[PDB]
């Protein structure tokens, strides 16, 4: 086998990431929104 | 003017053009009633010496006191210093005023105040 690494002889095969040479672009899952809120919870306010 | 994110909040005529040096735009925006807008402007102008502190500007909004030479006074006193009756500013009796209602409409020239 060649996948395993042996340190003594510096034996480590070099390979490329499978998803970098050939891109499988399926888009992304973004059905729901995604909101950033205000620290206090209520942003603006008034007086009453 | 300051606190940049003020233009997204609702505003207070007193939290923009009173407790702060304001734009007549935000003043215009908040007022629209251009007659009282001119009034508030007249205020600001006369209150140019009443910009600070806040209660000084509140009193200058009340208008019972004359500021400096008396451009802002809006009371009910219509008598001379010595009790002589005040002549109507617009009327020509007994003198035709070169300086009258037409020349100074922004001072809110009352009957004889
Ligand atoms: Ca402001
Ligand atoms: Ca402002
Ligand atoms: Ca503020
Ligand atoms: Ca505005
Ligand atoms: Ca405003
Ligand atoms: Ca206030």
UniProtKB/TrEMBL annotation, chain A:
Inducers of expression: Expressed in the late phase of the viral replicative cycle.
UniProt-annotated location(s): Host nucleus; Virion
Lineage: superkingdom: Viruses
Subunit structure: Homotrimer. Interacts with the capsid vertex protein; this interaction binds the peripentonal hexons to the neighboring penton base. Interacts with the hexon-linking protein; this interaction tethers the hexons surrounding the penton to those situated in the central plate of the facet. Interacts with the hexon-interlacing protein; this interaction lashes the hexons together. Interacts with host dyneins DYNC1LI1 and DYNC1I2; this interaction might be involved in intracellular microtubule-dependent transport of incoming viral capsid.
Described purpose of this protein according to its UniProt entry: Major capsid protein that self-associates to form 240 hexon trimers, each in the shape of a hexagon, building most of the pseudo T=25 capsid. Assembled into trimeric units with the help of the chaperone shutoff protein. Transported by pre-protein VI to the nucleus where it associates with other structural proteins to form an empty capsid. Might be involved, through its interaction with host dyneins, in the intracellular microtubule-dependent transport of incoming viral capsid to the nucleus.
Other noteworthy facts: All late proteins expressed from the major late promoter are produced by alternative splicing and alternative polyadenylation of the same gene giving rise to non-overlapping ORFs. A leader sequence is present in the N-terminus of all these mRNAs and is recognized by the viral shutoff protein to provide expression although conventional translation via ribosome scanning from the cap has been shut off in the host cell.
Family per record: Belongs to the adenoviridae hexon protein family.
Name listed for the protein in its UniProt record: Hexon protein
Source species: Human adenovirus C serotype 6 (HAdV-6)
Taxonomic placement: Viruses, Varidnaviria, Bamfordvirae, Preplasmiviricota, Polisuviricotina
The encoding gene: Hexon
Residue range from the parent sequence: 387 to 434 of 963
